[PDB]
Coordinates of C-alpha atoms in Angstrom, one line a residue:
Chain A
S27 CA 0.0 0.0 0.0
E28 CA 3.1 2.0 -0.2
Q29 CA 3.6 0.4 -3.6
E30 CA -0.1 0.1 -3.8
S31 CA -0.8 3.8 -3.5
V32 CA 1.5 3.9 -6.5
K33 CA -0.8 1.5 -8.3
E34 CA -3.9 3.6 -7.7
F35 CA -2.2 6.6 -9.2
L36 CA -0.9 4.6 -12.1
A37 CA -4.3 3.0 -12.9
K38 CA -5.9 6.5 -13.0
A39 CA -3.0 7.9 -15.0
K40 CA -3.6 5.1 -17.5
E41 CA -7.3 5.8 -17.9
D42 CA -6.5 9.5 -18.6
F43 CA -3.9 8.6 -21.1
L44 CA -5.9 6.0 -23.1
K45 CA -8.7 8.6 -23.6
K46 CA -6.4 11.0 -25.3
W47 CA -4.3 8.3 -27.1
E48 CA -7.5 6.9 -28.8
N49 CA -8.8 10.4 -29.5
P50 CA -5.9 12.8 -30.1
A51 CA -6.1 16.6 -30.2
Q52 CA -5.6 18.0 -33.6
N53 CA -5.3 21.5 -35.3
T54 CA -5.5 23.6 -32.1
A55 CA -3.8 26.8 -33.3
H56 CA -2.3 28.5 -36.4
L57 CA 1.1 29.9 -37.2
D58 CA 0.0 33.5 -37.5
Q59 CA -1.2 33.5 -33.9
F60 CA 2.5 33.5 -32.8
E61 CA 5.2 36.1 -33.1
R62 CA 8.6 34.5 -33.9
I63 CA 11.4 35.7 -31.6
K64 CA 14.5 33.5 -31.7
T65 CA 15.8 30.1 -32.8
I66 CA 17.0 28.4 -29.6
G67 CA 17.7 25.0 -31.2
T68 CA 18.4 23.4 -34.6
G69 CA 19.3 19.9 -36.0
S70 CA 18.5 17.5 -38.8
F71 CA 15.3 16.8 -36.9
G72 CA 13.9 20.3 -37.1
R73 CA 14.3 23.5 -35.1
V74 CA 12.9 25.0 -32.0
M75 CA 12.0 28.7 -31.8
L76 CA 10.9 31.0 -28.9
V77 CA 7.5 32.4 -29.9
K78 CA 5.0 34.7 -28.2
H79 CA 1.3 33.9 -28.5
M80 CA -0.5 37.2 -29.3
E81 CA -3.9 36.7 -27.7
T82 CA -2.3 35.8 -24.3
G83 CA 1.2 37.2 -24.3
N84 CA 2.6 33.8 -23.2
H85 CA 5.9 32.6 -24.4
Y86 CA 6.3 29.1 -25.8
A87 CA 8.9 26.9 -27.4
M88 CA 7.7 26.0 -30.9
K89 CA 9.2 22.9 -32.7
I90 CA 9.1 23.2 -36.5
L91 CA 9.5 20.1 -38.7
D92 CA 9.8 20.3 -42.5
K93 CA 7.5 17.6 -43.8
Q94 CA 9.6 16.8 -46.9
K95 CA 12.7 16.6 -44.7
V96 CA 11.0 14.2 -42.2
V97 CA 10.0 11.8 -45.2
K98 CA 13.6 11.9 -46.4
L99 CA 14.9 11.0 -43.0
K100 CA 12.3 8.2 -42.8
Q101 CA 10.9 9.6 -39.6
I102 CA 7.2 9.7 -40.6
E103 CA 6.0 7.0 -38.1
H104 CA 8.3 8.4 -35.4
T105 CA 6.9 11.9 -35.8
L106 CA 3.3 10.6 -35.7
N107 CA 4.4 8.8 -32.5
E108 CA 5.9 11.9 -30.9
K109 CA 2.9 14.1 -31.4
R110 CA 0.3 11.4 -30.4
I111 CA 2.2 10.5 -27.3
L112 CA 3.0 14.0 -26.1
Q113 CA -0.6 15.2 -26.6
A114 CA -1.8 12.3 -24.3
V115 CA 0.7 12.3 -21.4
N116 CA 0.5 14.4 -18.2
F117 CA 3.3 14.2 -15.5
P118 CA 5.1 16.9 -13.6
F119 CA 8.4 16.1 -15.2
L120 CA 7.3 16.0 -18.9
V121 CA 7.2 19.1 -21.0
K122 CA 3.6 20.1 -21.8
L123 CA 2.4 20.3 -25.4
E124 CA 0.1 23.3 -25.5
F125 CA -0.8 23.3 -29.3
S126 CA -0.1 21.4 -32.5
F127 CA -0.9 22.2 -36.1
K128 CA 0.4 21.9 -39.7
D129 CA 0.3 23.9 -42.9
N130 CA 1.3 23.2 -46.5
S131 CA 5.0 22.8 -45.6
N132 CA 5.6 22.2 -41.9
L133 CA 4.4 20.5 -38.7
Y134 CA 4.3 22.6 -35.5
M135 CA 4.4 21.5 -31.8
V136 CA 4.1 24.3 -29.3
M137 CA 5.4 23.5 -25.8
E138 CA 5.7 25.4 -22.6
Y139 CA 8.8 27.6 -22.6
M140 CA 11.6 26.8 -20.1
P141 CA 13.9 29.9 -20.0
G142 CA 16.2 28.0 -17.6
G143 CA 17.9 26.0 -20.4
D144 CA 19.0 22.4 -20.6
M145 CA 20.8 20.3 -18.0
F146 CA 23.6 19.8 -20.5
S147 CA 24.4 23.5 -20.4
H148 CA 24.7 23.8 -16.6
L149 CA 26.4 20.4 -16.1
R150 CA 29.2 21.2 -18.6
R151 CA 29.9 24.6 -17.1
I152 CA 29.8 23.5 -13.5
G153 CA 31.8 20.4 -14.4
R154 CA 30.0 17.9 -12.2
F155 CA 27.1 17.6 -9.8
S156 CA 27.4 16.4 -6.2
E157 CA 25.8 13.1 -5.4
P158 CA 22.8 14.8 -3.6
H159 CA 22.4 17.1 -6.6
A160 CA 22.7 14.1 -9.1
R161 CA 20.2 12.1 -6.9
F162 CA 17.5 14.8 -6.9
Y163 CA 17.5 14.8 -10.8
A164 CA 17.8 11.0 -11.0
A165 CA 14.8 10.6 -8.7
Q166 CA 12.7 12.7 -11.1
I167 CA 13.7 10.5 -14.0
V168 CA 13.0 7.3 -12.0
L169 CA 9.4 8.5 -11.4
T170 CA 9.0 9.6 -15.0
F171 CA 10.1 6.3 -16.3
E172 CA 7.8 4.6 -13.8
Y173 CA 5.0 6.7 -15.3
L174 CA 5.9 6.3 -19.0
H175 CA 6.6 2.5 -18.8
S176 CA 3.3 1.8 -17.1
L177 CA 1.7 3.3 -20.3
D178 CA 3.7 0.9 -22.4
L179 CA 5.9 3.8 -23.7
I180 CA 9.6 3.5 -24.2
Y181 CA 11.4 6.9 -24.3
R182 CA 14.7 6.0 -26.0
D183 CA 16.6 9.3 -25.9
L184 CA 17.5 10.0 -22.3
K185 CA 20.5 12.5 -22.1
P186 CA 21.2 15.9 -20.4
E187 CA 20.4 17.7 -23.7
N188 CA 16.8 16.5 -23.5
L189 CA 16.2 17.7 -19.9
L190 CA 15.1 21.3 -19.3
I191 CA 15.4 23.1 -15.9
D192 CA 12.3 24.9 -14.8
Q193 CA 11.9 28.0 -12.6
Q194 CA 11.7 25.8 -9.5
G195 CA 14.9 23.9 -10.3
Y196 CA 13.0 20.7 -11.3
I197 CA 13.4 18.8 -14.6
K198 CA 11.3 18.5 -17.7
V199 CA 11.8 15.8 -20.3
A200 CA 11.4 17.1 -23.8
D201 CA 11.8 15.7 -27.3
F202 CA 9.7 12.5 -27.8
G203 CA 11.0 12.0 -31.4
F204 CA 11.8 8.3 -30.6
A205 CA 9.2 7.6 -28.0
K206 CA 6.9 4.6 -29.0
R207 CA 4.0 2.8 -27.4
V208 CA 4.9 -1.0 -27.6
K209 CA 4.0 -4.1 -25.7
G210 CA 6.9 -6.6 -26.0
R211 CA 9.9 -6.1 -28.2
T212 CA 11.1 -3.5 -30.8
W213 CA 14.1 -3.2 -33.1
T214 CA 14.8 0.3 -34.3
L215 CA 18.3 1.6 -34.2
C216 CA 17.9 4.9 -32.5
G217 CA 19.1 7.0 -29.6
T218 CA 22.4 8.8 -28.9
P219 CA 25.8 6.8 -29.0
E220 CA 26.9 7.4 -25.4
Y221 CA 23.5 6.3 -24.0
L222 CA 22.8 3.2 -26.1
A223 CA 22.4 -0.2 -24.2
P224 CA 24.5 -3.2 -25.6
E225 CA 21.3 -4.8 -27.0
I226 CA 20.6 -1.9 -29.3
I227 CA 24.2 -1.8 -30.6
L228 CA 24.0 -5.6 -31.3
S229 CA 20.6 -5.3 -33.2
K230 CA 18.7 -7.5 -30.9
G231 CA 15.0 -7.1 -30.0
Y232 CA 14.9 -4.9 -27.0
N233 CA 12.5 -3.4 -24.5
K234 CA 12.2 -0.7 -21.8
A235 CA 15.3 -2.0 -20.1
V236 CA 17.2 0.3 -22.5
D237 CA 15.8 3.3 -20.6
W238 CA 17.1 1.9 -17.3
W239 CA 20.6 1.4 -18.9
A240 CA 20.5 5.0 -20.1
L241 CA 19.6 6.1 -16.5
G242 CA 22.9 4.5 -15.4
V243 CA 24.7 6.5 -18.1
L244 CA 23.0 9.8 -17.0
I245 CA 23.6 9.3 -13.3
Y246 CA 27.2 8.6 -14.0
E247 CA 27.6 11.6 -16.3
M248 CA 25.9 13.9 -13.7
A249 CA 28.1 12.7 -10.9
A250 CA 31.4 12.2 -12.7
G251 CA 31.1 15.1 -15.2
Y252 CA 31.8 12.9 -18.2
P253 CA 30.1 9.7 -19.5
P254 CA 31.1 6.1 -18.6
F255 CA 31.8 5.4 -22.3
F256 CA 33.5 8.1 -24.3
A257 CA 35.8 8.3 -27.3
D258 CA 36.2 10.5 -30.4
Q259 CA 33.9 8.6 -32.8
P260 CA 30.7 6.4 -32.2
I261 CA 32.3 3.1 -33.2
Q262 CA 34.9 3.5 -30.5
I263 CA 32.0 4.3 -28.0
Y264 CA 30.1 1.1 -29.0
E265 CA 33.2 -1.2 -28.4
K266 CA 33.5 0.3 -24.9
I267 CA 29.8 -0.3 -24.2
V268 CA 29.9 -4.0 -25.4
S269 CA 33.1 -4.8 -23.4
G270 CA 31.4 -5.4 -20.0
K271 CA 33.8 -3.1 -18.3
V272 CA 33.2 0.2 -16.5
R273 CA 35.6 2.5 -14.5
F274 CA 34.3 4.7 -11.7
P275 CA 35.9 8.0 -10.4
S276 CA 37.5 7.6 -6.9
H277 CA 35.1 10.2 -5.4
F278 CA 32.0 8.0 -6.2
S279 CA 30.5 6.6 -3.0
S280 CA 30.3 2.8 -2.6
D281 CA 26.4 3.0 -2.8
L282 CA 26.6 4.9 -6.1
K283 CA 29.0 2.5 -7.7
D284 CA 26.7 -0.5 -6.7
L285 CA 23.6 1.2 -8.1
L286 CA 25.6 1.9 -11.3
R287 CA 26.9 -1.6 -11.6
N288 CA 23.3 -2.8 -11.6
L289 CA 22.0 -0.2 -14.1
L290 CA 24.9 -0.6 -16.5
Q291 CA 24.5 -4.4 -16.5
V292 CA 24.9 -6.1 -19.9
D293 CA 23.0 -9.2 -18.6
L294 CA 19.3 -8.3 -19.0
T295 CA 18.3 -10.9 -16.4
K296 CA 20.2 -9.0 -13.8
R297 CA 19.7 -5.3 -14.8
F298 CA 17.7 -3.2 -12.3
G299 CA 14.4 -2.0 -13.6
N300 CA 13.9 -5.3 -15.6
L301 CA 13.5 -7.9 -12.8
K302 CA 10.5 -9.3 -10.9
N303 CA 10.7 -6.3 -8.5
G304 CA 10.7 -3.8 -11.3
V305 CA 11.3 -0.1 -10.5
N306 CA 11.3 -0.9 -6.7
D307 CA 14.8 -2.5 -6.9
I308 CA 15.9 1.1 -7.9
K309 CA 13.6 3.1 -5.6
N310 CA 14.6 1.0 -2.6
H311 CA 18.4 0.8 -3.2
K312 CA 20.7 2.3 -0.5
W313 CA 21.7 5.3 -2.8
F314 CA 18.1 6.6 -2.6
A315 CA 17.6 5.8 1.2
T316 CA 17.2 9.5 1.9
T317 CA 14.9 10.2 -1.1
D318 CA 11.3 10.9 -0.2
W319 CA 9.6 9.9 -3.4
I320 CA 6.2 11.6 -2.8
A321 CA 7.9 14.8 -1.7
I322 CA 9.8 14.8 -5.1
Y323 CA 6.5 14.3 -7.1
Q324 CA 4.8 17.1 -5.3
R325 CA 7.8 19.4 -5.8
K326 CA 8.3 20.1 -2.1
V327 CA 12.0 19.1 -2.0
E328 CA 14.3 22.1 -2.1
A329 CA 16.3 22.1 -5.4
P330 CA 20.1 22.2 -5.4
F331 CA 20.1 24.8 -8.1
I332 CA 17.6 27.4 -9.5
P333 CA 18.6 29.1 -12.7
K334 CA 18.7 32.9 -12.8
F335 CA 15.5 34.5 -13.9
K336 CA 15.9 37.3 -16.5
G337 CA 12.3 37.6 -17.5
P338 CA 9.7 35.6 -19.5
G339 CA 11.1 35.7 -23.0
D340 CA 14.7 35.8 -22.0
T341 CA 17.0 33.6 -24.2
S342 CA 20.3 34.1 -22.3
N343 CA 20.5 30.3 -21.5
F344 CA 20.4 29.2 -25.1
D345 CA 23.1 29.5 -27.8
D346 CA 22.8 31.7 -30.9
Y347 CA 21.7 30.0 -34.2
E348 CA 21.4 31.1 -37.7
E349 CA 17.8 32.5 -38.4
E350 CA 16.1 30.7 -41.2
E351 CA 12.7 31.8 -42.6
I352 CA 9.6 29.7 -42.3
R353 CA 8.7 28.9 -45.9
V354 CA 5.1 27.9 -46.4
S355 CA 4.5 26.6 -50.0
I356 CA 1.3 27.3 -51.8
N357 CA 1.0 23.6 -52.6
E358 CA 0.3 21.0 -49.8
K359 CA 3.2 18.7 -49.3
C360 CA 2.9 15.1 -48.0
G361 CA -0.8 15.3 -47.2
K362 CA -1.5 11.6 -46.8
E363 CA 1.7 10.9 -44.8
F364 CA 0.8 13.4 -42.1
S365 CA -3.0 13.2 -42.3
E366 CA -3.4 12.2 -38.6
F367 CA -1.1 15.0 -37.3
Chain B
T257 CA 43.3 12.4 -16.0
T258 CA 40.0 11.1 -17.3
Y259 CA 38.5 14.5 -17.1
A260 CA 41.3 16.1 -19.1
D261 CA 40.8 13.4 -21.7
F262 CA 37.1 14.2 -22.0
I263 CA 37.6 18.0 -22.2
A264 CA 40.1 17.5 -25.1
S265 CA 37.7 15.2 -27.0
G266 CA 35.5 16.1 -29.9
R267 CA 32.3 15.0 -28.0
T268 CA 31.9 17.6 -25.2
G269 CA 29.2 19.6 -27.1
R270 CA 25.5 18.7 -27.6
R271 CA 25.3 15.2 -29.1
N272 CA 23.1 14.3 -32.0
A273 CA 20.8 11.3 -32.1
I274 CA 21.6 8.5 -34.5
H275 CA 19.4 6.5 -36.9
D276 CA 19.8 4.0 -39.7

């Protein structure tokens, strides 16, 4: 009934999700309702811009995908997954999708804006997080994966770049570009090199255990300041991952190392998160013996770090990108491919 | 040191996702 209060929450969470999953929100705004301010992210998989919604004056982060470019990258089904999943989920540590729409040329997903920036930014600059600091963030990802995995979702891109820091110092997971709802096994080669579980690299069928492996990587990176497996090129990273060996900094506590040995376990029959006890093997480990799990969910734990507020609209925590116009063709592109978006 | 090796590497910036 400790773990059974958890089940009452998770069964209600599931009812809520299934309603939206089976009946997704569609066409809830239009481009010319937003003022474009700044590009705060780019990449092969679209771009992200700070925008202001005119009728409210709220700031949001607007993801823009070129439909023709999605097709070329063979990410149609993955993009349909991203939007359908994000419009259906509701958890304190997931970024909220406020609007979605499309025009002749692009797809748009408008999320709440987090002026605080990504964890990546802050972690690289500070160098490393203390164990208590690492633990606070890791507890939020533990709860988030509990949530997601109970909905049959695998997330598949855990890394500091995808975690935003809010105004209270708590985390928000963004970018669901590889998230998928799957019972049983799946096979797609996706993720980021440093975070991939051995089973992905070896093209085996895999499951939600790959998210628990990635948690191992993240905790390590947070607490060490560098990842457990690094080299100059991906192929050298994969050799290290599939070797079975991992070295821990001397400042790592004996409880942290033991947690990590169990998350970064090549043998799926022994990896924490994947066994008969599930998430509780993680939640009840000695490293999290001080962690009040409900207090974390309710955001009543004091955060180790709160980013400096410079206003709504401030972009000081993001880098500078080349501004590219939003072309909207007069002919509809890829209508059938993205009909459900 | 391991830290010095990381900081001198080509993979200290934001990392891109892979795909097939």
